[PDB]
Structure 1
């Protein structure tokens, strides 16, 4: 820790606290993530064990690069590349100007890039949301914060129920399914893709049932036709109001036809029909995709 000049605190977590730093020798600006170990009780937190070990195996342009771990007995720091700001702060900068469509198309292509890498290396992220998404001045976007991620198996075997932020949590977790795979990161990305377009959050519920009804009002309440099996999921209740599906030009007004189609396949109720990241890549939406800078 001698080589680092901490420059400013940039935020939070729960086990951990984030900083901007520089090497006093190479000049490199990094991000330092501090976690407290308190050196007596529990040892190394498992979010950290998870994060570090998964990240080691996920080097890809669209995913924060882990640079270093420093294991000072009772604090643990992680050294990441420093990207310039997260997607939420960006969204707040521009929610009045709009985010240009070319940039959106580009950020999404790149999240589909790095997310498909994960899913091919049996990692689920499980906490996509713009505060976890980082952007750099040259046009790049990278998935970050892997504390809540986990290596999965084929087929899956019942991971943590208590999972994904809320506004981003797929109906199958909301409804208390026993299994859930790579579709949960997709749902989140849909919400993401939508939130960039309209600049409001797609589904801002305040409880789990609120969350559900907001999904239902927007995408129509699901049945055995559109999602075989719903009627018998643990948290399903036949007393759910029956709403109809809105029209997406109404839900995401600024979005062209190829887009709404993809967002739509991203938001399919059936996790088995929900488009994977790899197929999402070869979608018409992506005929001619560029790499714009953020003009802010």
Structure 2
């Protein structure tokens, strides 16, 4: 409570402060959660319960909880992957750092999924970086424990730019694939230092995808043409060459990215399989 001396305000959603423990000297992130009428918010209930079951080098560590505001105490990392991309915009991020970072995100995500947890908000602003060159999944407020097989879950999930097509077309069921999509959209955004699918609307987002990966038909993605928001009027665009879409990226790089951006979620590559892809044959830990 009184042990923490606030250094700076470092963001706002759901306010987050950088702070120091006055007795141990430890630097932390304080996520302040205001209550006051409805009790303890569903986002905090879910973020706390899930992070306590999720101990991974590549998942952000929750250090404590405090109760009329509620404070989440997390380990501090100085950088999010958006501020890092907006700093490498001109020069570009090095190939073997993109490979390290991807490899690490897939590792945390594999752990998440194997502990029956969906993130449902993978975007750069929620991925945190340290100085030793580690990256970590953050903001589990939009997460959820899921069953086998899944049942129908909240429709309004994932930031539009990273939203998976089966959510936009409003499939009754969605699962782990939707997080793999998100990382595909991220992988590409590191390679080409630009948002892959920066749509302003649910319709634009779909069309930006179709215009790049081609308009799905019953042969790519069986069942698609009878999905609740699929209209037969949609422009049938052709699939682009990945030479054009990710120009820098090697043959293995391309193979991994298409597999991560499959239309049919039952065919999309899993976090477990992705980790074993030949793209990851010579990984290191740069800075």
- Identify whether the pair has TM-score above 0.5, normalized to the shorter chain: yes
Question: Could you say which residue in structure 1 is the equivalent of 2:70?
Answer: 76
* TM-superposed deviation, 1:105: 0.2
Measure, in 2, the Cα distance between the counterparts of 1:25 and 1:101.
Answer: 42
Q: Deviations over 1:120-159 (max 9, x none)?
A: 0000000000000000000100000000000000000000
Measure, in 1, the Cα distance between the counterparts of 2:83 and 2:274.
Answer: 26
Measure, in 2, the Cα distance between the counterparts of 1:117 and 1:109.
Answer: 13
Query: How many pairs align?
Result: 287
Measure, in 2, the Cα distance between the counterparts of 1:87 and 1:4.
Answer: 26
Question: Could you say which residue in structure 2 is the equivalent of 1:85?
Answer: 79
Q: Deviations over 1:87-127 (max 9, x none)?
A: 00000001111000000000000000000000000000000
Question: Could you say which residue in structure 2 is the equivalent of 1:5?
Answer: 5
* TM-superposed deviation, 1:84: 1.2
Return the match for 1:166 from 143, 160, 168: 160
* TM-superposed deviation, 1:67: 0.0
Measure, in 2, the Cα distance between the counterparts of 1:234 and 1:44.
Answer: 34
Secondary structure of residue in 1 paired with 2:86 = helix
Measure, in 2, the Cα distance between the counterparts of 1:247 and 1:139.
Answer: 32
* TM-superposed deviation, 1:13: 1.1
Point out 4+ residue stretches in structure 1 off by more than 6 angstroms.
none
TM-score normalised by the chain length of structure 2: 0.99
Measure, in 1, the Cα distance between the counterparts of 2:125 and 2:83.
Answer: 8
Q: Deviations over 1:49-76 (max 9, x none)?
A: 00000000001000100000011xx100
Are 2:170 and 1:176 equivalent residues in the alignment? yes
TM-score normalised by the chain length of structure 1: 0.96
Secondary structure of residue in 2 paired with 1:31 = strand
Residue segments in structure 2 that go unaligned for 5+ positions in a row:
none
Secondary structure of residue in 1 paired with 2:160 = coil
* TM-superposed deviation, 1:210: 0.2
* TM-superposed deviation, 1:177: 0.3
Secondary structure of residue in 2 paired with 1:94 = coil
Question: Cα RMSD over matched residues?
Answer: 0.5
Question: Could you say which residue in structure 1 is the equivalent of 2:51?
Answer: 55
Measure, in 1, the Cα distance between the counterparts of 2:216 and 2:70.
Answer: 46
